Design a protein around this ligand. Structure first.
Ligand SMILES: O=[N+]([O-])c1ccc(O)c(O)c1
Ligand SMILES: O=[N+]([O-])c1ccc(O)c(O)c1
Ligand SMILES: O=[N+]([O-])c1ccc(O)c(O)c1
Ligand SMILES: O=[N+]([O-])c1ccc(O)c(O)c1
Ligand SMILES: [Ca+2]
Ligand SMILES: [Ca+2]
Ligand SMILES: [Zn+2]
Ligand SMILES: [Zn+2]
Ligand SMILES: [Zn+2]
Ligand SMILES: [Zn+2]
Lengths: 524, 524
């Protein structure tokens, strides 16, 4: 048998430096984890021991920290080149700075192939990008070859800024003919590497005939065989075994997010490229693995421009930005309005004749707003100032919620009103009226929401059966501050942009801000 | 006696081309008036006949039409140079593009002195601007000399964008020592030329000892001796005679606005520079005076870039901009919200610890909103599109109104609701609730306004005795659409920027707009 070791990352999301256990800023070095210097050590160790190794990334290196804000993907090309990745699939966040922000920093500077079989271009863009990403690439491994066919979420136009030329085809439709082609070219070992989420990964494993293993991403899925090594709870075994339509067992893998784990799968193939066995587990990149000193020193050199950027003026406020808990845990606060307005502006995507924009609504728990910003420093706002307001390194995510779920969330928001608890909601595109004299669970007396399927945005009563798109912190999507109904009842959840970055981009676009308290939240 | 002929303009406000009788676009050439080509003819004729002539401008050539939007003051230097102005005082609107937008296009290119004795600079700006404007200039006229001392509204920081270096001193305080100095230098004929308004002009005539004649502006004041020649109603005789504190009679002149009239004052002086007599009248520049063909041809050449600019994309909308009368004369309309938001953004000026901004409030009659803009031209908005919405060439002005006056205006807004009449008000920084079941004059049941003297903007009930700053069309400041209470009760009124220009600047700043209907106006 011929044994291949697949090492894989996904959804690293700009975690160049080691992180805390919950993938926020590293504070206690002895408990820190991940980062590219530590990954380098582990990858180098495995490549010394195993003959046939591929190191693969399933997309979403872009977006997540000040690294991406400042270096705009140059850090991804540089550090992925240093680790000697063998291939990468395009993720949705690779389009966050448009097609231009993908071509210049990453496609032109990567020393490895970048893959997606289900993205097509037309007009001048087609000529401009031809060959800079590929549907697949056949790689030599020892005296053998392995084909690697890429794919990217069909939902990318709703989840990033790819622009109106690129077309994202159904993944299975696009993949099958490429896998068929590889079989005709005597490539009998085929990895599907791509960025659509665990559910689609299982469908690809089932339906794309000739795929031997699926290496996925997007959904931040943690899979594990045995006792988990940290706080992440497995969604299933590693690998997850799909029974294909052709009758074969097909392993599906993912490795969480944020560079906390290195995926590790060993596959035995027969002479005809059939999988005989597969086994492995993600490896927790904890402090027992030393950071490579060379990579760490290069990281520290690149950090100088981040420190410089962090104290520069992003824009100005002419108003006090009231992020005090005495305001934002009790009533509408203008810092809450600012952040929700920034969230909505970040999620302006291309729209049909069917909607002015696909999403119009925002909620933000007051517990997540951690400081005010004073306007009397000549109005200046810096990244450092925003990091005091939003210190946890989270994202502002897109979810789909029934109106009934959103009504329960607003009842939760005031169920124990008066105690300065975190669950009180700041809003955008929502007007709520509470009557605190009513019983807990029955205090919401008016709830109106901004239409999407309308040419003129206006407010309509929330309907209980309708499904609404909402932008909210990942903390709330995961049931934080007691919002278990959001976690348990949401229909769809896709990870968004970094919290500080969303607000910084809005302030830099606006140049001078003046958010008011305007009646989004009222009391009877 | 030595006779001087003073020819003077003020508040021309970018009316390079001839205009209609009400200083909007020229449609019927036989009834058009003003413009620089016609002014050239008249000035040339007078200079052939009179030996001792000065042609003076009292400021506010900047701001008023697409000429200023495109050429940014280059048109002012070019055409004032062609007419051979002898001197100009700085007006408030000369600061609309900051100090940089005054220095480069106008102070560096004018072939005549530009004057203001009550503006001082500090730090590097003082060195940068030294001598580019002057407190006064002594001009040869025949075998005599005439001193001309300039002044500019002390309120300019509230009415333009001069920036935080320049200091605007009290006019009389700054003028007297310069007039004293000129007397010590044997200059016995002194004109005060400046831009503070008729009321301040009369105070200067009264209190600045040694001023022989005041040539003013800013207030668009029409003065006339006899039967007026057009629709403007005189505020007093031409000249207006002030009795000075030194006992002398001092003539005060102004010549309306928009280049419709050329001021013409003949002054007889004795050997000691005392005024013996003065007489004259503004000359209506009607179609009986031919346009100079050379100047007209140069105007037509400069117009090519205006035609090109007018169809360029300013920015995008992702929403239908509902400027229909069926919406904007009956309920809150999103075109009204856009225009009022643009009005407030245009009036963001430098602020103390006493206010986030000096003005927070806007009203706009639905009768002034003349078209929608459809978003399905790839979202594009052009100047031509905005000119369909705002076709009358007006301004968005700053007024001070008691709360009682503003309550009467909102009662007027709905006094005959249901007939599609123009007086229904769109708003910014105001939330109104009507109950149409109540008697006319008693239909406003809630009226809340955005604070100014606050670090966090929020809404408070309107108080009847408080004086509020409001941004509104000149049409309403002048009592249009039946708003006689505004005209008769306002405390202060200063002319603002051109209506289309205000909206175009906002759209270009924002890049992508999405105004909603949000509850600024509600009905019980
Ligand atoms: O936000 N900052 O200022 C940062 C963040 C990460 C860094 O490594 C840094 O050197 C500065
Ligand atoms: O980050 N949050 O949202 C938090 C953090 C601490 C809290 O006590 C909380 O209730 C919410
Ligand atoms: O608004 N435009 O398009 C204009 C306005 C004035 C002009 O003289 C012109 O040639 C075009
Ligand atoms: O320009 N306006 O505001 C107008 C123009 C015509 C009207 O009939 C009116 O009621 C208002
Ligand atoms: Ca195979
Ligand atoms: Ca004199
Ligand atoms: Zn991701
Ligand atoms: Zn993703
Ligand atoms: Zn003026
Ligand atoms: Zn003025």
């Amino acid at each position: 048998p011929w044994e291949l070791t697949i090492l894989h990352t996904n959804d690293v999301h700009s975690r160049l430096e080691q992180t805390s256990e919950d993938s926020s800023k590293c504070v206690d070095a002895s408990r820190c984890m991940g980062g590219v210097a530590r990954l380098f050590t582990k990858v180098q160790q495995i490549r010394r021991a195993e003959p046939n190794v591929l190191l693969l990334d399933a997309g979403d290196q872009y977006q997540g920290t000040i690294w991406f804000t400042v270096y705009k993907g140059a850090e991804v090309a540089h550090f992925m080149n240093a680790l000697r990745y063998d291939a990468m699939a395009l993720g949705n966040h690779e389009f966050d700075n448009g097609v231009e922000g993908l071509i210049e920093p990453l496609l032109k500077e990567a020393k490895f192939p970048i893959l997606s079989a289900n993205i097509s271009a037309s007009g001048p863009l087609a000529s401009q990008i031809s060959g800079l990403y590929l549907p697949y690439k056949v790689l030599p491994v020892g005296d053998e070859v392995v084909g690697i066919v890429g794919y990217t979420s069909k939902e990318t136009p709703f989840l990033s800024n790819p622009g109106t030329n690129l077309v994202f085809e159904d993944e299975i439709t696009a993949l099958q003919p490429e896998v068929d082609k590889l079989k005709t070219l005597n490539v009998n070992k085929i990895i599907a590497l791509g960025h659509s989420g665990f559910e689609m990964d299982k469908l690809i494993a089932q339906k794309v005939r000739g795929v031997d293993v699926v290496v996925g991403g997007h959904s931040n899925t943690f899979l594990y065989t045995g006792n988990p090594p940290s706080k992440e709870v497995p969604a299933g075994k590693y690998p997850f075994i799909v029974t294909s339509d052709d009758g074969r067992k097909v392993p599906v893998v993912q490795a969480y997010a944020f560079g906390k784990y290195l995926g590790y799968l060993k596959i035995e193939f027969d002479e005809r490229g059939n999988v005989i066995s597969s086994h492995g587990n993600p490896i927790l990149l904890d402090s027992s693995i030393p950071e490579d000193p060379s990579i760490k020193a290069d990281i520290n050199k690149w950090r100088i421009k981040l420190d410089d950027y962090s104290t520069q003026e992003l824009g100005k406020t002419i108003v006090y930005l009231d992020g005090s808990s005495q305001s934002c845990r009790f009533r509408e606060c203008n810092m809450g309005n600012l952040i929700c307005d920034a969230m909505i502006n970040n999620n302006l995507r291309h729209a049909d004749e069917m909607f002015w924009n696909h999403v119009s609504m925002c909620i933000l728990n007051g517990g997540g707003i951690r400081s005010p910003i004073d306007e009397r420093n000549d109005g200046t706002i810096t990244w450092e100032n925003l990091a005091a307001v939003l210190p946890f390194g989270g994202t502002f995510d897109l979810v789909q919620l029934k109106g009934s779920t959103l009504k329960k969330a607003f009842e939760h928001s005031v169920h124990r009103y008066g105690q300065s608890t975190g669950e009180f909601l700041q809003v955008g595109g929502i007007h709520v009226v509470y009557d605190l004299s009513r019983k807990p669970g029955d205090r919401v007396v008016k709830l109106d929401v901004l239409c999407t399927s309308c040419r003129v945005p206006s407010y309509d009563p929330l309907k209980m059966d309708e499904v609404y798109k909402v932008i909210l912190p990942n903390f709330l999507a995961n049931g934080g501050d007691g919002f278990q109904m959001i976690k348990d009842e949401l229909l769809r959840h896709d990870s968004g942009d970094q919290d500080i970055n969303v607000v910084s981009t809005y302030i830099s676009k606006m140049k001078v801000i003046y958010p008011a308290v305007e009646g989004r939240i009222k009391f009877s």
